[PDB]
From a paper:
A potential workaround to the size limitation in cryo-EM is to bind a small protein of interest (the “cargo”) to a much larger carrier (the “scaffold”) in order to make it large enough to visualize readily. Analogous to antibodies, sequence variations in the nonconserved loop regions of a DARPin protein can be selected in the laboratory in order to obtain a variant that binds nearly any protein of interest.
For imaging experiments, we investigated three different sequence variants of [name]—single site mutants [name], G12C, and G13C—in their GDP-bound forms. All three [name] variants were found to bind with good occupancy to our cryo-EM scaffold (presenting the [name]-specific DARPin). Following similar protocols as for the G13C mutant, for the [name] mutant, we obtained a final map reconstruction with a resolution of 2.4 Å for the entire particle and 3.1 Å around the [name] protein. The maps and refined [name] structures were all closely comparable, with significant differences in the maps occurring only at the mutated amino acid side chains, as anticipated. As an assessment of coordinate precision, the rms deviation between the two most closely related cryo-EM structures (the [name] and G12C mutants) was 0.58 Å; this is slightly less than the differences when compared to previously reported X-ray crystal structure, which are between 0.73 and 1.1 Å.
Residue numbers in the entry:
A (entry chain B): 1 to 165
B (entry chain A): 163 to 320
The structure:
């Protein structure tokens, strides 16, 4: 059929590993090693057609890697996750975007902005600011919570629907 | 009390504190203690690159073929990182070379995809089935073609 290479990027501790395990194993991992980078494969059906997803959960960004570099170049979709209770993570989203822009060497790249930890009520980043950044970039914005499975499936499905368009 | 002691052992192995691990090991800490996913102290010591902690844990009785929630053994983590000293020590104590995770991937598959050629040569020496297919139907040779690894292709073909 068709295979998709989806890359999950963001700051450390934002919930990238919990997001990917929730999609695949339908389970919330309370604690995961912050340095393990691995690629997983899933078979899901989107709006009636089955497909294969090749998802990379990036980690350890301070050291050069060969698999990550190849994944970034050939990546078809990019999840830009950030935590809503950490302002520094949100500011880092621009840093990742410009690096992906120069790596891919393009102005229009299938991208979906993700805000994790929706269940924590100590919110520091408001929806208006996140939506304003998404509208300026032109990419859809979604709210997710790996603890309560809130919008986990809609995040990945929307990204695939963005690649098709 | 017993569970709190185990959580200290896992952190000491990950941090790489030789004195801390030995003290907790004689205190009654369990070598087979694991966190939520299933990482044992052998999983974390092999991952981060500590040799003496792996040797000490193995002699105490840590299970060499334990797997986490995704079915990955300590040989998997050491192969994906490029730890040539650790993998040979793990093979010397009788570890499974043809183990598979929930995606049916062999430590050869992981090392070949990341690009560690010296790790691949050791696994091929100790009898790693090159003609192994995962649950999605790929071989280590297919990885070399897809990733354009001519050096890996030469090793795989030979
Ligand atoms: N409350 C809450 N905590 C989360 C959520 N996602 C992740 N976490 C916590 O964030 C911590 C670190 O996340 P982690 O999986 O390491 O993200 P990573 O560093 O990008 O791999 C974990 O201990 C989780 O308990 C969420 O949706 N809600
Ligand atoms: Mg992670």
């Amino acid at each position: 059929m068709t295979e998709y290479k989806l890359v999950v990027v963001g700051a450390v501790g934002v919930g990238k590993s919990a997001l990917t395990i929730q999609l695949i194993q339908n389970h919330f991992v309370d604690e995961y090693d912050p340095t393990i980078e691995d690629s997983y494969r899933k078979q899901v059906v989107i709006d009636g057609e089955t497909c294969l997803l090749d998802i990379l959960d990036t980690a350890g960004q301070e050291e050069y890697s060969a698999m990550r570099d190849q994944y970034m170049r050939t990546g078809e979709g990019f999840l830009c996750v950030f935590a809503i209770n950490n302002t520094k993570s949100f500011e880092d989203i621009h840093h990742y975007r410009e690096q992906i822009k120069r790596v891919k060497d393009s102005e229009d790249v299938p991208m979906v902005l993700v805000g994790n930890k929706c269940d924590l009520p100590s919110r520091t980043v408001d929806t208006k600011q996140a939506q304003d950044l998404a509208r300026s970039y032109g990419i859809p914005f979604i709210e997710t919570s790996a603890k309560t499975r809130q919008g986990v499936d809609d995040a990945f499905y929307t990204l695939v629907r963005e690649i098709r368009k | 009390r017993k569970e709190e002691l185990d959580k200290k052992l896992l952190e000491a192995a990950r941090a790489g504190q030789d004195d801390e691990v030995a003290a907790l090991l004689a205190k009654g800490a369990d070598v087979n203690a694991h966190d939520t996913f299933g990482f044992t102290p052998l999983h974390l010591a092999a991952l981060y690159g500590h040799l003496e902690i792996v040797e000490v844990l193995l002699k105490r009785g840590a299970d060499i073929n334990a797997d986490d929630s995704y079915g990955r053994t300590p040989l998997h983590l050491a192969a994906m990182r490029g730890h040539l000293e650790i993998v040979e020590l793990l093979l010397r104590w009788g570890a499974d070379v043809n183990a598979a995770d929930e995606e049916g991937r062999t430590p050869l598959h992981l090392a070949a995809k990341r690009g560690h050629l010296e790790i691949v040569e050791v696994l091929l020496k100790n009898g790693a089935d090159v003609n192994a297919q995962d649950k999605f139907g790929k071989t280590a040779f297919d990885i070399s073609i897809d990733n354009g690894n001519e050096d890996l292709a030469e090793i795989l073909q030979k």
